[PDB]
Design a protein around this ligand. Structure first.
Ligand SMILES: N[C@@H](Cc1c[nH]c2ccccc12)C(=O)O
Ligand SMILES: N[C@@H](Cc1c[nH]c2ccccc12)C(=O)O
Ligand SMILES: N[C@@H](Cc1c[nH]c2ccccc12)C(=O)O
Ligand SMILES: [Mg+2]
Ligand SMILES: [Mg+2]
Ligand SMILES: [Mg+2]
Length: 787
RNA sequence: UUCACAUUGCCCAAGUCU
RNA sequence: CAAUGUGAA
């Protein structure tokens, strides 16, 4: 329950495809490098201040440092050793003591062996050392954000308004591979505050043209909410905006305007404006400090502008990474060549395989088979594998009568019954109930009435005028209070129906009512399906940036048949920003019990797809969650020990894959085709991992999902696990498309997001309250309410 | 709240000194 | 899932 298994073999399925990856080969010298520890007092100074201190120090004590790199905290590295036995030094800032002592030697050669087959595991300390080398210069030249670097783009202004603009940048990371050390580079963009005078900032915030008396309370509060917490220089952080203008704002030995008239001989041009409190500064003498990322949520218009800047087709992104690398010229970096490192300026060539899609089996009389082409099929001339007969249903229209008329509802109804009959999900008649209502208050009594009145009620269709709190209320009552199936539809999709939208709607409705839309062609499935097997999907979703006390939400779903198609869900609230699923053992236990009730089999194998865990968390997560899965098995039955396969799925990494031949580019966005698999060259030197781009990239540059096997009792071959994973991407019921992650992992997301809706404005006694809020009704417990 | 893909928001990372 | 885009039988 600890060390990840070795790669068993390499995959062989699928035709080959030439690819380019945004990985750049590194040539590392075979020398010892030297690690030193650095203590600085005081030790709360920002990482950038620490970097500053060291670099002025290094160029000070040259002849006592005969080009060291620094990680901004405690670690310093040199290519050739120092004369230095601990030493304590003295430096001066634009009054620091720096402790510099030798701790160890880092051999890059040892890393060379780990990249070879000689060493089983890559020595992390070597990788970190290389990362610090590659990060030293851009950490002082640019503005660091995570593993990325941002700067104002020379020659261009990309304003967002409101005092904000777009900074362009890039992600940078160092990683081992089957081939060589690789520099992973991707381009990015993010919102920064303009380094403008506060006066101009005021005008952009308050939508002023020039500069238009003292400020309205509404003007003062808006400007206060925009600048509070930001840094300004004439270096201060703004904590408040005064209520009084500089004319009258007073401080004990006496106004602000008079102090500046007297001491600095400065007569304020706009004394009618309030002061920033940081002790008060007039707006006129203050600039917004450059390089402050905008943490706050962007406006709708700012988002739109941002999208129209970070939106690039695959070839466009490919070209921009390449142009960045050729302009970056990593090989002229003084610290890089100091350590004898050479970075290749061209993308690494990789050979991928394009896996064949499974056939999708439908039902009805014809029992049609659909063949995915480039990640997409459709349901024309096809019926559900198991279609639901809808006898008793109701409509609740919360949209206004004037806009969503009885004629609209009638026309929507007839169109839906037509599409649903074609799909093999016959809606046998008119609804038994159809009424208008308004506001969240009407939801609960209306649904109780429906439940008490109409025996065998199967569904409530709910018409919503658009974004409204009524939706959350409908799901609260439907999912957790009364246990009733609901399907919501936006008014505009009732007013104007299309075959495609109605058809997609029927996919969800059939599923919600217990139907089977389609199944993988049974004979086309990998050998693992010969024995009872349960597929688990797990995810944790964390609160937005800046949030302080909202819980994280853990969701786990499990397959309930052999197709696999039907899933049951479990969900939990847990500690703020904790990734480890705390109550997993209980969740899996529930799923195993439900599996046995549905199939009358005990799983001989458990396949666990775990979404969103980064490399630095692998061992911690695996340790708790693998043991949790075992615990669930143990407490169920004596010596019940099914084989566990633990797979981490990452969609949000920085690996991009491009077609080498423009002949292979698919569609407008020019992405790699669905099914493209990579398990050589750029993947892990010893462990079992692969990229699988399972979906059609219709938009921008596709994110190829990465799969990392942390544990495998079942000893999968590369081929079977890759094919299995790909096939599970075709089992997602909400669309006739191969999706970007396997359906169980995707369902886990939907469950987590539904719980978040159950918690809107509700997030010991605290925990029990929130836990109760996400607990679904007994009747809902065994349904796909999350669809 | 028809749906997928894409950008960001999510663990690690990053960030915090008159 | 929220904001914003591009798309679909
Ligand atoms: N029903 C199958 C058993 C089976 C195979 N694979 C499964 C996966 C899940 C559940 C059951 C199964 C049989 O007896 O032939
Ligand atoms: N404990 C289950 C039955 C069961 C025993 N061993 C199992 C292994 C897997 C799934 C279910 C089981 C019950 O209460 O009915
Ligand atoms: N099969 C493993 C142990 C194991 C796998 N799955 C389990 C589930 C529960 C308990 C133990 C296990 C072994 O060789 O020992
Ligand atoms: Mg997650
Ligand atoms: Mg942390
Ligand atoms: Mg959206």
């Amino acid at each position: 329950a600890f060390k990840p298994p070795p790669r068993p073999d390499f995959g062989t399925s699928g035709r080959t495809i030439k690819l380019q990856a945004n990985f750049f080969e590194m040539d590392i010298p075979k020398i010892d490098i030297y690690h030193y520890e650095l203590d600085i007092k005081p030790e709360k100074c920002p990482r950038r201040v620490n970097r500053e201190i060291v670099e002025h120090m290094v160029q000070h004590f040259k002849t006592q440092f005969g080009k060291p790199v620094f990680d901004g905290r405690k670690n310093l590295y040199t290519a050739m050793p120092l004369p230095i036995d601990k030493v304590e030094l003295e430096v001066t800032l634009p009054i620091f003591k720096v402790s510099i002592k030798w701790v160890s030697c880092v051999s890059l050669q040892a890393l060379h062996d780990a990249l070879s087959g000689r060493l089983p595991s890559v020595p992390f300390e070597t990788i970190q050392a290389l990362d610090v080398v590659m990060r030293h210069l851009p950490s002082m030249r640019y503005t660091p954000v995570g593993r990325s670097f941002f700067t104002a783009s020379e020659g261009c202004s990309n304003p967002l308004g409101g005092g904000r603009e777009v900074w362009f940048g890039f992600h940078q990371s160092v990683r081992p591979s089957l081939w060589k050390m690789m520099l992973n580079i991707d381009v990015s963009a993010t919102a920064f505050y303009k380094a403008q005078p506060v006066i101009e900032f005021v005008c952009e915030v308050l939508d002023f043209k020039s500069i238009e008396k003292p400020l309205t309370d509404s003007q003062r509060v808006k400007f206060t909410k925009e600048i509070k917490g930001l840094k300004v220089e004439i270096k201060y952080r703004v904590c408040n905006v005064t209520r009084r203008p500089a004319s009258h704002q007073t401080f004990p030995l006496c106004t602000v305007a008079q102090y500046f008239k007297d001491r600095h001989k400065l007569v304020l041009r706009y004394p009618h404006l309030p002061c920033l409190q940081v002790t008060y500064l007039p707006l006129e003498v203050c600039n917004i400090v450059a390089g402050q990322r905008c943490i706050k949520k962007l406006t709708d218009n700012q988002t739109s502008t941002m999208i129209r800047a970070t939106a690039r087709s695959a070839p466009d992104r490919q070209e921009e990474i390449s142009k960045l690398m050729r302009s970056a010229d990593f090989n002229t970096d003084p610290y890089v060549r100091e350590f004898g490192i050479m970075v290749k300026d061209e993308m690494t060539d990789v050979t991928g395989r394009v896996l064949q899609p499974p056939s999708i089996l439908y039902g009805g009389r014809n029992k049609a088979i659909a063949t995915p082409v480039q990640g997409v099929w459709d349901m024309r001339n096809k019926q559900f594998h198991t279609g639901i007969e809808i006898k008793v249903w109701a409509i609740a229209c919360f949209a206004p009568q004037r806009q969503c008329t009885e004629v609209h509802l009638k026309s929507f109804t007839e169109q839906l019954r037509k599409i649903s009959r074609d799909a093999g999900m016959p809606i046998q008649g008119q609804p038994c109930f159809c009424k208008y209502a308004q506001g969240a208050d009407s939801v609960e009594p209306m649904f109780r009435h429906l439940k008490n009145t109409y025996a065998g009620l199967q569904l409530v269709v709910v018409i919503l005028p658009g974004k409204t709190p009524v939706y959350a209320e409908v799901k609260r009552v439907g999912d957790t209070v009364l246990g009733m199936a609901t399907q919501c539809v936006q008014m505009k999709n009732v007013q104007r129906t299309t075959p495609q939208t109605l058809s997609n709607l029927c996919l969800k409705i059939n599923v919600k009512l217990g139907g089977v839309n389609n199944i993988l062609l049974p004979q086309g499935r990998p050998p693992v399906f010969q024995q009872p097997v349960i597929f688990l999907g797990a995810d944790v979703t964390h609160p937005p940036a800046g949030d302080g006390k909202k819980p994280s939400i853990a969701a786990v779903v499990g397959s309930m048949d052999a197709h696999p198609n039907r899933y049951c869900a479990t969900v939990r609230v847990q500690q703020h920003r904790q990734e480890i699923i705390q109550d997993l053992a209980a969740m899996v236990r529930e799923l195993l019990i439900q599996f046995y009730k549905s199939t009358r089999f005990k799983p001989t194998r458990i396949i666990f797809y775990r979404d969103g865990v980064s490399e630095g968390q692998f061992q911690q997560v695996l340790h708790h969650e693998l043991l949790a899965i075992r615990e669930a098995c143990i407490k169920l039955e004596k010596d019940y020990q099914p084989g566990i396969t633990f797979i981490v799925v990452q969609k949000r990494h920085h690996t991009r894959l491009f077609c080498t031949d423009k002949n292979e580019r698919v569609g407008k966005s020019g992405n790699i085709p669905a099914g493209t698999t990579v398990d050589t060259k750029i993947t892990h030197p010893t462990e079992f991992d692969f990229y699988l781009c399972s979906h059609a990239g219709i938009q921008g540059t596709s994110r190829p999902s990465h799969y990392h096997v942390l544990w495998d009792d079942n000893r999968f071959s590369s081929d079977e696990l890759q094919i299995l994973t790909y096939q599970l991407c075709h089992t997602y019921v909400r669309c006739t498309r191969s999706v970007s992650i396997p359906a169980p992992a995707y369902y886990a997301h939907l469950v987590a997001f539904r719980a978040r809706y159950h918690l809107v404005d509700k997030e010991g006694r605290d925990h029990q309250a929130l836990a109760k809020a996400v607990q679904v009704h007994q009747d809902t417990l065994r349904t796909m309410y999350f669809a």
